[PDB]
């Protein structure tokens, strides 16, 4: 029964080499398919980047035809990617995928995916922002976490007695450094007398941040 | 072209149909066998449809495909919640000598009446200021569909640079949520005046401005 696995670094630097190698199991390479790869940015469509069969053809996108090198070897169920001179734009999803030779063309299985970070950034704490309104029944506070690295981040809120509905929003990933926000709604009306924080808890740079939201 | 069009959404109701377009230039999807797959954001692609019209193993009869030689489309009758996806067409394109995807389609399977964003728009704040730097935050929530468009203004003019928005994710209560920034220099904040966020979800916008001076 045929399963595909990627594995390799989910941090890259730009300029080195990005590497992943995808394990098949449960299917004969030597078979009449194709072994490929295909990659998706957050929030974006779907790139196909090159395959490979067992007699040596190999396809390549031919906008990065001269960075990229694909290859197999059944001996040890492996389909590999090298893609050279790593950018900021290289950040994505990373899929293996069987694909079907001749005029077919069609794609499956695919791995489940592997996260590929292209940064060069240092473990760095966000800077936390409180975000106030500028001067209806309820008010929306909170706090932007900017330039962090790595992922992840947590924020709570403490809002005293108010009852409250908080939303946290999905970081993006600009220039090798995070930015997410979070918000929290209380009623119209209680803050600024009644207290509101956030706490945004970095655990990879040992860091938390308790910064109370000051009107303007 | 490198990438095939596709509408951005589709929605209807459990029981309803929906049909996605994938087109190419002139007619050269008659040359190429159109696939097609769904994805739920959170996970990998599967193939539904191959050959233009054929069907995998597992995939039910619901699911139908056509090939006009300009245009490919996949009709999917009888909607249930777990169709729920976003849905990519691909074909080799043979002027390209590459293998191109569409451009992508969410398919929302009505569960929950419409419901229009709830917009808040930041200024920076002093704190960010001090570091010569500006953000603005648009935050975005209870929408439903899932789908928003995001363009800014400053002193009544379309921004075109500095602005990224992120995907929707889901609410606790399966609405949807989202928050858009536009990155600015101190100084470009302290030489503008007026900044507004206008949020476009079912074809009505709803916008929130501000002015620095306040």
């Known amino acids: 029964q045929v399963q595909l696995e990627e594995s390799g670094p989910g941090l890259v630097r730009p300029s080195e080499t990005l590497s992943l190698s995808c394990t098949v199991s449960?299917?004969?390479?030597?078979?009449?398919?194709?072994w490929g790869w295909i990659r998706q940015s957050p929030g974006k469509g779907l790139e196909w980047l090159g395959s490979?069969?067992?007699?040596?053809?190999?396809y390549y996108r031919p906008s990065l035809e001269s960075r990229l090198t694909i290859a197999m070897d059944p001996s040890k169920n492996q389909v590999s990617l090298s893609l050279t001179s790593v950018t900021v734009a290289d950040s994505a999803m990373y899929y293996c995928?069987?694909?079907?030779?001749?005029?077919?063309?069609?794609?499956?299985?695919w791995g489940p995916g592997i996260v590929v970070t292209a940064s060069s950034a240092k473990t760095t704490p966000p800077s936390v922002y409180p975000l106030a309104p500028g001067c209806g029944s309820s008010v929306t506070l909170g706090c932007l976490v900017k330039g962090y690295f790595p992922e992840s981040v947590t924020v709570t809120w403490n809002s005293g007695s108010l009852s409250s509905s908080v939303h946290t929003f999905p970081a993006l990933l600009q220039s090798g450094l995070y930015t997410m926000s979070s918000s929290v709604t209380v009623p119209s009306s209680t803050w600024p007398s009644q207290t509101v924080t956030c706490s945004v808890a970095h655990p990879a740079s040992s860091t938390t941040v308790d910064k109370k939201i000051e009107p303007r | 072209q490198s990438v095939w069009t596709q509408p951005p959404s589709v929605s209807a109701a459990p029981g309803q149909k929906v049909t996605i377009s994938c087109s190419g230039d002139?007619?050269?999807?008659?040359?190429?066998?159109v696939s097609w797959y769904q994805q739920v954001p959170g996970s990998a692609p599967k193939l539904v449809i191959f050959?233009?019209?054929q069907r995998p193993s597992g995939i039910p009869a619901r699911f139908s495909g056509s090939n006009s030689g300009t245009t490919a489309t996949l009709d999917i009758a009888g909607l249930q919640r777990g169709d729920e996806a976003d849905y990519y067409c691909?074909?080799?394109?043979?002027?390209?000598?590459?293998?191109?995807f569409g451009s992508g389609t969410k398919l929302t399977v009505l569960g929950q009446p419409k419901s229009s964003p709830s917009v808040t728009l930041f200024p920076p704040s002093s704190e960010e200021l001090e570091t010569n730097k500006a953000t603005l935050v648009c935050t975005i929530t209870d929408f439903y569909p899932g789908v928003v468009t995001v363009d800014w203004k400053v002193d009544g003019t379309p921004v075109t640079q500095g602005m990224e928005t992120t995907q929707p994710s889901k609410q606790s209560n399966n609405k949807y949520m989202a928050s858009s920034y536009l990155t600015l220099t101190a100084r470009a904040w302290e030489r503008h005046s007026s900044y507004s966020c206008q949020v476009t979800h079912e074809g009505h916008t709803v916008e929130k401005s501000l002015s620095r001076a306040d």
């Open positions: 995928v069987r694909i079907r030779g001749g005029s077919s063309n069609w794609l499956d299985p």
């Open positions: 449960g299917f004969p390479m030597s078979e009449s398919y194709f």
């Open positions: 490979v069969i067992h007699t040596g053809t190999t």
């Open positions: 002139d007619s050269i999807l008659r040359s190429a066998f």
């Open positions: 050959d233009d019209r």
């Open positions: 691909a074909a080799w394109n043979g002027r390209l000598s590459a293998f191109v």
